[PDB]
Every structure is written in structure tokens, then in C-alpha cells.
Design an enzyme around this catalytic site. Structure first.
Site, short mmCIF file in Angstrom:
data_model
loop_
_atom_site.label_atom_id
_atom_site.label_comp_id
_atom_site.label_asym_id
_atom_site.label_seq_id
_atom_site.Cartn_x
_atom_site.Cartn_y
_atom_site.Cartn_z
N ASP A 50 -2.15 -5.07 0.85
CA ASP A 50 -1.59 -3.95 1.55
C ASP A 50 -0.22 -4.19 2.16
O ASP A 50 0.66 -3.32 2.08
CB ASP A 50 -2.57 -3.52 2.60
CG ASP A 50 -3.89 -3.10 2.00
OD1 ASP A 50 -3.86 -2.40 0.99
OD2 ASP A 50 -4.97 -3.44 2.50
N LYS A 94 -15.38 -8.64 1.18
CA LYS A 94 -13.95 -8.67 0.82
C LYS A 94 -13.49 -10.07 0.39
O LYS A 94 -12.83 -10.19 -0.63
CB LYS A 94 -13.03 -8.12 1.93
CG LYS A 94 -11.59 -7.87 1.43
CD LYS A 94 -10.63 -7.28 2.48
CE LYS A 94 -10.55 -5.76 2.44
NZ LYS A 94 -10.22 -5.26 1.07
N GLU A 135 0.83 -1.19 0.00
CA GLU A 135 0.00 0.00 0.00
C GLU A 135 0.89 1.27 0.00
O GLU A 135 1.92 1.31 0.66
CB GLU A 135 -0.85 -0.03 1.28
CG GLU A 135 -1.64 1.22 1.66
CD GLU A 135 -2.88 1.48 0.79
OE1 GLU A 135 -3.09 0.79 -0.24
OE2 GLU A 135 -3.69 2.36 1.16
#
Ligand SMILES: Cc1cn([C@H]2C[C@H](O)[C@@H](COP(=O)(O)O)O2)c(=O)[nH]c1=O
Ligand SMILES: [Mn+2]
Length: 179
Positions: A92, A118, A64
Site C-alpha cells: 500500500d 496476512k 494503493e
């Protein structure tokens, strides 16, 4: 020129604000119009950096915050050296201790539901998921929360502070309803 936009600029550090602006521009969105999204991205960024700061030194590779091309380059390097399967979406972080990719989520709704939404969307069985909410709840893959309780507690404290600041400016309802 919205209040949310100036709120976000006076609440988050300039490094996060700049990374968030770049992210949105790369996607194609505008921080001045899509302002709840600007806030969401800043929040996610901060949490991801607080989270990488929770381990020992070198525990996490931070994915990320990088340019998309460079993000995938680092993912491929990790895959090609740990033999882990390559995810279909950008995570991430990568955890060198547990040898797994992590996707951190931050939701203004129910943790349970965001997790599920998700899981499906990722379509990468091996990627670990850890959701935090603005009410202090969290949900992690296999109930394995990665970090110790103190490092997670400070994340949750920070999210609740963002919530209060927003509510004091009458911006919370709108941010909550816009997810
Ligand atoms: C929940 C949420 C996340 N995001 C962003 C934050 C992150 O930059 C990216 C991935 O978020 P997630 O990992 O929490 O799904 O999407 C939004 O733009 N709008 C939203 O409503
Ligand atoms: Mn994430």
C-alpha cells in the site's frame, strides 16, 4: 439496487468511490452485487490515504490507488534505487524514512488472526504490516506503529464512525458476517 451501495456512495468522497469502482472492475467484480466488498475497498482506500497524510511531507510513496501496471512500476523504481527486496504482492505504501514497504489491513474480525493470515499470504519477509480494526485495535510488525499516536487515533475514530453509521442502518451485521 441495495442499501449498502447507496450508503457507501453517500458516506465516502467521490474520488475514493471512483477508485474503488475501478479496482473492482479491474479485478472483475461488480459494486452493485458484491456490495460489502465495495464498502471494504472504499474503507481501505480512505485509511491508506489518512495514513499517508500522517507523516511529514514526502515521507510516503502511495502505491494503493494506482493502476496495477503503474503500481508495480513505482515498486520497481523504489526497489531499484533503495536496494530493498521486491515484494511478491503489492503493498500500500512505501516509507522513505524507515525504508520499508507497508501493507495496511482493515478487519471486522480479530486483529491477531488477520495479522497472521496476512503474514503467510504476503510471503515477503521485509514488508511491514499494520492492521486496524473497526473496534479500535491495531497490530503492527515488531510493535513499531510508524506514525504518532494522534494520526492513528483519527484513523480509528473514522472506522468506528463507519461502524455506527452502518449499525444505524442495520447494515453492520451483514458487513461483519461477510468478511
Ligand atoms: C478485509 C477485506 C479486504 N478487502 C480488500 C480491501 C483492499 O482493497 C484489499 C487489500 O486488503 P487488506 O490489505 O486489508 O488485506 O482487499 C476485501 O475486498 N474484502 C475484505 O473482506
Ligand atoms: Mn492493505
Amino acid at each position: 439496487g441495495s442499501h449498502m451501495e447507496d450508503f457507501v456512495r453517500q458516506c465516502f468522497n467521490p474520488m475514493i468511490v471512483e477508485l474503488a469502482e475501478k479496482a473492482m472492475k479491474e479485478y472483475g467484480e461488480d459494486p452493485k452485487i458484491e456490495t460489502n466488498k465495495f464498502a471494504a475497498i472504499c474503507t481501505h482506500l480512505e485509511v491508506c490515504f489518512m495514513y499517508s497524510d500522517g507523516g511529514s511531507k514526502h515521507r510516503f510513496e502511495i502505491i494503493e490507488g494506482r493502476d496495477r501496471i503503474m503500481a508495480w512500476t513505482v515498486v520497481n523504481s523504489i526497489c531499484n534505487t533503495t536496494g530493498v527486496e521486491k515484494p511478491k504482492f503489492l503493498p500500500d505504501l512505501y516509507d522513505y524514512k524507515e525504508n520499508r514497504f507497508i501493507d495496511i489491513g482493515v478487519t471486522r474480525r480479530e486483529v491477531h488472526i488477520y495479522y497472521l493470515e496476512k503474514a503467510n499470504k504476503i510471503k515477503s519477509e521485509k514488508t511491514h504490516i499494520h492492521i486496524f480494526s473497526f473496534t479500535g485495535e491495531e497490530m503492527a510488525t515488531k510493535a513499531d506503529y510508524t506514525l504518532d499516536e494522534e494520526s492513528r487515533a483519527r484513523i480509528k475514530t473514522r472506522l468506528f464512525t463507519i461502524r455506527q453509521e452502518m449499525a444505524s442502518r442495520s447494515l453492520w451485521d451483514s458487513f461483519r458476517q461477510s468478511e
